[PDB]
Amino acid sequence: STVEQVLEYVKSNNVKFMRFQFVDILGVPKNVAFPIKAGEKGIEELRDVLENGLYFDGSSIEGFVGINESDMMLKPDLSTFSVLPWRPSEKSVARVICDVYTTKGKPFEGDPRGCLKRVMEEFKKEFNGEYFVGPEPEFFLLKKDPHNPHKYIPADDGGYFDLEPMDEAPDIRRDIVFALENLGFHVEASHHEVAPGQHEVDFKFDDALKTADSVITFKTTIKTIAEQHGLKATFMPKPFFGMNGSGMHCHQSIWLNGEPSFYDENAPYQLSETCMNYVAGILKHAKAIVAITNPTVNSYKRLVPGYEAPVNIAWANSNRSAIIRVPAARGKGTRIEFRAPDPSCNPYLAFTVMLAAGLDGVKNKLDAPEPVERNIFAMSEAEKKELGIESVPANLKAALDELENNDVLKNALGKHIFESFLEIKNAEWDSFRTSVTDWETTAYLKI
Template sequence: MGLLYFWRDKLMEHMEFLEQLNTYSIKFLRLQFVDVAGNLKNVAVTSENVGEVLKKEMTFIHNGEKVLFEPDLESLTVLPWRPREGAVGRIYGNLLLPNDEQKIICPRKFFTRFNLPLEVAVEFSFYLQEKVQEKTPVDHAGLWDVSPLDLGENLRRDVVLTLEKMGIGVKYSGHGAHPGEQVLGLKPVKGNKLPDILTTAKFVVRTIAERHGLNASFFPYHHKKPGLSVKYTFLGEKEETEKLYQKIVTLLPEAEIIFRPLINDYYGYPQKPENFIFYDGDHIVLTVSPKANPYLVLSLLAIETNVNAQNPVLAADFGQALRRFSESTKLREFFGELFWRYLKIKQKSYFDFWSRVHEEGDNGD
């Protein structure tokens, strides 16, 4: 009987989903997922082919291997900037290997295994740049400046309104400290929901910027100064937050390349734990690179480890952070297959960087 109830519930869930597609006149459905590095990807299908998605039969090639899309039907959202007639919907999902669904290759799938009861607020920033002159900031305003110095007001307004239509609350917005820098602070949510929300918010920012004829950059290093960041604020009881703080500080040396995944993240930043994590006995603020994969960052909070939060020494550069990560038995056992995939990506980045350096040196001779 249990199996019968399971399939009955599945059928009802599928019927409700199809009814939603019809109610919102959704013609195209974007199947969105996040790769190991944290980049948002998608495959679009028409409403006529949604049956394959519901039956978990939608396969495609990603990074040279055949993958299966596992839909999260509760994540359905209509993209509000697209026409209402023949509307475009979006759902998140996870990637599986068709012949080995138990092997976890998707950071989002990995993250869903854990329960994070703490509420988390997040603040993130991005640069608005002119499209014609690449990397030219849209203005030269400073922290919390107003118009006419601040030329990002209208765009931020459109972003906030769009996010609210998609069910994402914004607590505040304004101009950042650097030329063209914009800041958004999202309302606190349960930790389990945050990675999807942050990923969606970045997607909306890029889309709205494009519609304004501008480019939104999340590259962490700009104007020859350390700039952009994502700040996670963890809220909870003192006992909870104190344990979490000790855990994060203990993990920092081994997991630093998850918090700071790019070579540029190590330029100009003081190598001190207090620059990344702040704790006042009430809440924790964790500052990471805007390119850090939020699913991996928050998954780290679920590691069972003996805390040793005594003066951790952080990496001097990307290479040292990479070596520490590669030698971590703790992280290798925790992440499993994802560990090796993430390591491979970072090793390639490091190799490509030094290859370019040597090529430029040879050309200079």
């Protein structure tokens, strides 16, 4: 957190490299290594670079600035210092997540991290609240197909919570948990998931900024540790058809004045009015939130309408068929689980749109619908239409049009992020709709 606490770690623990990490518009991490020199001269050089930051070409980063105005800076947040465990111990490598700033020393408008800081500071100023998030990012461990090395397949034919040798990843998950604990994570649980080769490593909830910094670090840690064990980890929302997809369920709650505002001992389901207003806001902008929280073309193969998925815009208690599920835990742990996201989204922008839509419901005091305790997959389309259970868009372009017409998310993301995201994703969608797919070749080459 303090300059001296970082410099004295570097002196005693023999740190040789400092990675200045950040994220592009799509949530891909980017960094530059700075070599620390020995003695006081090296520590005073590092002090200048930690306080004043360093320059970088912004035109090469996705969704940042043009070539004619490329000069940018990185101001390190010292409260995010950590030692990368996958790197060597002697002459160790360390990281410090930064905020992208303009040449004039002003926070960059198109920065995803600064976008989340802005909305959290605005929430803390207006309501004196703290936005807490706890995600469940699932992933797949892959190995080369023996019949064809150009394709990849799942690492094992394991099921949900299966034991070894059926589950061939206890050693891979073991090292992942050790690596995350060294990075400052409070790991809660680890196990095999429903689909073959699928796994899930959960971690404790925290404020949206610390949680988004943890999601970026979690994705790199899982990919780099898998390569050490000769495997390849992917956070693709649906790498294989006919089996479960990778989902990042976001358990969330807001605490006004250091108290659990979502809990109300004397109320229906022990849920406060603030909780219901927040849920109403998420359900209102649900068709627009999935553009950010599900930004890939493949996301709409897991989150597919008309088929078993968290596509139905409705809330329910202890029911995994609806888009929102209220876990049975009460008191401090009273929360809502937004099941629509997948680990392909930028966490900084995902928590921004969720907090903005949720706070829109709290500010206007919007009325939430009744909980659909029944299984929604077993219901017919005519029955769901009578109840008013709408579905999330069927494809990426359908979600981008909903995001474009939404003014609540446009203001939260800002003109720079909102317009660049739509422009990048429309070019990505155009590339998909023009390409001749393998499905088409299989179905129409015979005609």
